[PDB]
Structure 1
Amino acid sequence: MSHSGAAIFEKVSGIIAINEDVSPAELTWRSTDGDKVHTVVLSTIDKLQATPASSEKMMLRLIGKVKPQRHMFSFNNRTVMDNIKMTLQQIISRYKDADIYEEKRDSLSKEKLLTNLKLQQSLLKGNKVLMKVFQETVINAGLPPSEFWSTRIPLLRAFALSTSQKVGPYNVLSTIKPVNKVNVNLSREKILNIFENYPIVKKAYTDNVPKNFKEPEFWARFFSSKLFRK
């Protein structure tokens, strides 16, 4: 498999295993007799160091971010080492992106419209000229709020319809193009559209976003997953 194999640590031979189920992922090295055990959390790894394929040695070092922590593993077969290098690269790359992201960061009738105080407050806050009239005519003069909005029904309706309309359905996943390093540009509008067209994505989104990992990691896994292809 690509998640386990033989390795030698500190001149001691043992089995190296890559644990990805537990978040954050950690690498556990277990000695043949089990006398000595070493475990390292992949979140602390800054860079991945691997010996060149042109050298007889087949070592592989995992350097930790800070006297930076250093873990050196010696393998026996290049294919086994290669089978583990690529898998380890995926975990670090996704977590590095997550770390980068973390560091970087009806109601259209006269009755209801005259009764929807939230909408009346919402439109008034944005509008400044209406504040001038409202402040003088309602606060100081004392005109009833209901009477003031009686003659401005079209104004209330126009503002409500702006935020009360939604675009039609469409093939959302087909628009996404991965465009080695490949970059994609998602948007909040795209996120909502994906959920509506594909309830399964929402099902896996609601149950894992706060629990396990941040949204950028979730969508990084989703696109790389076979589910996105399917």
Structure 2
Amino acid sequence: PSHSGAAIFEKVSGIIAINEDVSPAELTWRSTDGDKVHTVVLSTIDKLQATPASSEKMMLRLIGKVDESKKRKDNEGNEVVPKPQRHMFSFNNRTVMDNIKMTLQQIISRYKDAD
């Protein structure tokens, strides 16, 4: 467990930090100095997808919570279902993303049981 490493968001390179012992745990990206900051509250997150070590890509996705029971239909009556929003983060090593996702995954599973 490290909680913090190095991540890129919106082409601006920065450092990623996980927020626990706080009000519901949040994944806080900050700029390399930290003038820019983005926050992901995991009690509002449902899934997480990261680039494999076989993948050409260095990225980490964070899937948000959407209500899919509001299924919408088009003019002809075709099923058009609203999709959840995903948050990507670019990386330089697979050993970090798997360690950030590991913590994250352990945070959402707490809000997944709801006790």
**What TM-score does the superposition give when structure 2 sets the normalisation length?**
0.76
Considering Cα pairs closer than 8 Å and 6+ residues apart, tell me whether 1 or 2 has the greater RCO: 2
Q: Distance in 2 between matches of 1:48 and 1:93?
A: 12
Listed one character per residue, the Cα deviations across residues 48-99 of structure 1 (whole Å, up to 9, x for unaligned) are: 111223112221110111253321111111111222121111111121111x
What's the Cα RMSD here? 1.4
Give 1 or 2: higher helix fraction.
Answer: 1
Q: Structure 1: 5+ residue runs without aligned partners?
A: 99-230
| SS in structure 1 at match of 2:97 | helix
Percent of aligned pairs sharing the same letter: 100
Runs of 4+ in 1 over 3 A off after TM superposition: none
For residue 8 of structure 1, report the CA deviation from its aligned partner: 0.3
Q: Structure 2: 5+ residue runs without aligned partners?
A: 67-82
Larger Rg: 1
| SS in structure 1 at match of 2:88 | strand
Where does residue 56 of structure 1 map in the other structure?
A: 56
| SS in structure 2 at match of 1:91 | helix
CA contact (8 A) 2:27 2:41 kept: yes
Count of matched residue pairs: 97
| SS in structure 1 at match of 2:5 | strand
